[PDB]
């Protein structure tokens, strides 16, 4: 946690449903945006830490 | 915590519609059985 790996996500299609429909997680949350709407929205850049 | 709002619904409210429902909300492709993960109580509090 002192040295987190960041991935930059770009030039690709992002199926967030593979995250939010998966029972593989002890917690899942989204802020300012509904997770089901992330299958419609498009972004200049995305980042994963 | 005495004040609450509805965080989720199956469809948007019509003009001057009112909905007191405490039924569990199905947030994804999971069977919720009216009782957890992707199966949330739709009323939530600001905690002012």
UniProtKB/Swiss-Prot annotation, chain A:
Effect of changing residue 19 to I: reported as:
In strain: Omicron/XBB.1.5, Omicron/EG.5.1
What's the impact of mutating residue 24 to P? In strain: Omicron/BA.1, Omicron/BA.2, Omicron/BA.2.12.1, Omicron/BA.2.75, Omicron/BA.4, Omicron/BA.5, Omicron/BQ.1.1, Omicron/XBB.1.5, Omicron/EG.5.1
Q: Which domain of life is it from?
A: Viruses
The record's subunit annotation is: Binds to host ACE2. RBD also interacts with the N-linked glycan on 'Asn-90' of ACE2. Cleavage of S generates a polybasic C-terminal sequence on S1 that binds to host Neuropilin-1 (NRP1) and Neuropilin-2 (NRP2) receptors. Interacts with host integrin alpha-5/beta-1 (ITGA5:ITGB1) and with ACE2 in complex with integrin alpha-5/beta-1 (ITGA5:ITGB1). May interact via cytoplasmic c-terminus with M protein. May interact (via N-terminus) with host bilirubin and biliverdin, thereby preventing antibody binding to the SARS-CoV-2 spike NTD via an allosteric mechanism.
What is this protein for, i.e. what is its function?
Attaches the virion to the cell membrane by interacting with host receptor, initiating the infection. The major receptor is host ACE2. When S2/S2' has been cleaved, binding to the receptor triggers direct fusion at the cell membrane. When S2/S2' has not been cleaved, binding to the receptor results in internalization of the virus by endocytosis using host TFRC and GRM2 and leading to fusion of the virion membrane with the host endosomal membrane. Alternatively, may use NRP1/NRP2 and integrin as entry receptors.
**UniProt protein name:** Spike protein S1
Which part of the full protein is shown? Answer: 350 to 398 of 1273
